Ligand binder design. Structure first.
Ligand SMILES: Nc1ncnc2c1ncn2[C@@H]1O[C@H](COP(=O)(O)OP(=O)(O)OP(=O)(O)O)[C@@H](O)[C@H]1O
Lengths: 108, 490
């Protein structure tokens, strides 16, 4: 239900469609490994399948950029770490001394 | 092509004969074909091409993970309705139906994933004699396949899935940019192929996009006509993408990083003997296994010499077994790593294998004495095993504890020994000094005079000489350092 606006604008205006960006906080919360097992309600697996279907079989939606912020990459399902799905991964590490000075300046 | 011939000749031959003969004799057509290999080999491509090439029924492509849904069993059983009805209508005349299940191991692991197996096994064999259905199972991980399916009569045939092809796919990708006169002539595609050794198609697309990205950056902080992709972007973008392979040929090149000096003729003699043995292995058809031992005082330099001989050999296959690779492993892991390293040397017409510091692999310490008997026995057995038919090995092992090996009685396993004595005459020191351009002529003439009056017999290893020269270069370039230091290391 989140992608309806992008689909509508794409269908309406071809390549003139503006850029729509949606960002998923706490990505590892729901999209854990889809082979966890447990013999119970499967709503924790069809969620990944739905997102993967709307992200891979996009039907040529080329005006969407999803940003995912997390603290533990290892827990993310491996199926989403491949070309065409979350390609670029940027690591943010601890600041350097000059960055420390910049942060101190900004804070004060 | 070889697999393409095997699968066609052996499996897909029975259907050619007139149907009545098959019906009468009772010969049974092979049912299962398992194509396996690393990701990106194109297993899906081959699966698709097989159906069209053989003029078979339109393939039913179904994703492995999508199988997840009693409705899963309903789908599995419904899959076979068309083939069952078609065979019922005609019989032996039914056309060949092919079903491909991508990522078989995803759902067919050792309870939807169990009921699916139940349905498939119930339909596949027993009451049914449908020889018109061919199921192709493709998986990147062969070990994960259920044992219930790994048995005779099911998936009998297993098939395992280059530089030129890589260049061709590069051309395929580049066509659009090259045609529109936006590519500089300096870019050598073959060079990029030589750089990309362990990359798959998606990685190639990624490198293309990143290299273009650098050209994009060059413009943005109406001259769009000058947007050109340069070789520098291709060189720079290589840092983003990464492969998932490994090579040890580099390890055999770093061991000689310090280079040769030819400070004495015996070095040339040893090299000559090595080139003789390599030729002997190359030419004789009876000598299918040659073992050599290279022994000498510690620090004289033995790994570098063997690595040099191996690099001069030029054989298709060369490898090194060094302690560094085994560090941190448990015993049951070392014994398997050593076994695998040997088992991978029997798949090529000519092979060279180098073993480094034999006594260190065995964990020898003289206080006990303590050592690991299992690895010792494994190596002793391996060093005498003849390779399979028509394949030839050359093994060179380096050691520094000749006496210990004598005690263990392992010495009977080697065919010949080569001794490498460390330099003792000041002439060799002069050669090394001129080779290392340590000092001018006057200093290099005074050093010998200073030494001759203090230490007539030199007896120092080359490694120590090099390190001493390096450390003396800084404190006091004049002789007043070196002669002392070396006298201290005598
Ligand atoms: N025959 C040789 N001629 C010239 N340089 C050599 C020769 N052998 C070894 N060296 C130099 O010695 C350096 C280190 O020697 P190397 O590692 O082979 O010693 P080693 O005696 O095998 O060592 P270890 O003491 O670990 O048993 C190499 O970088 C190489 O440049």
């Amino acid at each position: 239900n989140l992608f309806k606006d992008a689909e509508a604008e794409y269908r309406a205006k071809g390549e003139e469609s503006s850029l729509h960006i949606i960002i998923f906080d706490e990505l590892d919360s729901v999209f854990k490994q889809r082979g966890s097992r447990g013999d119970g309600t499967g709503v924790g697996d069809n969620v990944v399948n739905q997102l993967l279907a709307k992200m891979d079989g996009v039907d040529q939606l080329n005006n969407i950029l999803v940003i995912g912020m997390t603290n533990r990459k290892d827990l993310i399902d491996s199926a989403l770490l491949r070309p065409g799905r979350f390609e670029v991964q940027v690591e943010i590490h601890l600041p350097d001394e000059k960055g420390r000075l910049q942060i101190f300046d900004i804070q004060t | 092509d070889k697999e393409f011939t095997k699968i066609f000749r052996r499996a897909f031959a029975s259907r050619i004969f007139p149907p009545s003969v098959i019906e009468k004799l009772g010969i049974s057509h092979v049912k299962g074909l398992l194509l396996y290999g690393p990701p990106g080999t194109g297993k899906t491509l081959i699966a698709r091409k097989i159906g069209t090439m053989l003029n078979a029924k339109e393939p039913k492509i179904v994703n492995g993970p999508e199988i997840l849904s009693g409705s899963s069993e309903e789908n599995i059983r419904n899959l076979f309705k068309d083939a069952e009805a078609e065979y019922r209508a005609k019989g032996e005349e039914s056309s060949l139906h092919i079903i491909i299940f991508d990522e078989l191991d995803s759902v067919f692991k050792q309870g939807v994933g169990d009921n699916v197996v139940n349905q498939l096994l119930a339909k596949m064999d027993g009451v049914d004699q449908l020889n018109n259905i061919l199921v192709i199972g493709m998986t990147n991980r062969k070990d994960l396949i259920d044992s219930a399916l790994l048995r005779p009569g099911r998936f009998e045939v297993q098939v395992e899935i280059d530089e030129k092809g890589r260049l061709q796919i590069f051309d395929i990708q580049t066509k659009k940019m090259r045609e529109n006169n936006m590519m500089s002539d300096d870019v050598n595609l073959a060079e990029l192929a030589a750089l990309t050794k362990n990359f798959s198609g998606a990685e190639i697309e990624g490198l293309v996009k990143s290299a273009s990205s650098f050209a994009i950056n060059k413009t943005v902080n109406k001259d769009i006509a000058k947007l050109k992709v340069t070789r520098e972007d291709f060189l720079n973008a290589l840092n983003d993408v990464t492969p998932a392979f490994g090579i040890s040929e580099e390890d055999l090149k770093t061991c000689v990083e310090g280079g040769m000096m030819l400070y004495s003729e015996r070095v040339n003699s040893i090299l000559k003997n090595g080139a003789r043995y390599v030729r002997q292995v190359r030419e004789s058809d009876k000598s299918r296994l040659v073992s050599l031992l290279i022994h000498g005082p510690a620090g004289s330099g033995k790994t570098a010499l063997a690595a040099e001989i191996a690099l001069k050999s030029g054989f298709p296959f060369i490898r090194l077994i060094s302690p560094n690779e085994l560090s941190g492993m448990s015993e049951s892991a070392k014994i398997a790593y050593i076994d695998n390293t040997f088992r991978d040397a029997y798949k090529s017409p000519l092979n060279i294998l180098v073993i480094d510091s034999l006594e260190t692999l065995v964990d020898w310490v003289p206080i006990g004495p303590r050592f690991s008997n299992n690895i010792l026995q494994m190596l002793k057995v391996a060093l005498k095993r003849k390779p399979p038919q028509d394949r030839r090995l050359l093994i060179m092992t380096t050691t520094s504890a000749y006496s210990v090996l004598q005690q263990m009685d392992i010495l009977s396993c080697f065919d010949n020994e080569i001794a490498v004595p460390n330099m003792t005459n000041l002439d060799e020191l002069n050669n090394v000094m001129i080779e290392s351009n340590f000092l001018d002529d006057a200093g290099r003439v005074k050093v010998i005079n200073e030494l001759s009056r203090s230490c007539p017999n030199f007896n120092v290893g080359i490694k120590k000489t090099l390190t001493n020269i390096e450390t003396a270069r800084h404190d006091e370039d004049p002789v007043n350092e070196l002669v002392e230091l070396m006298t201290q290391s005598a």
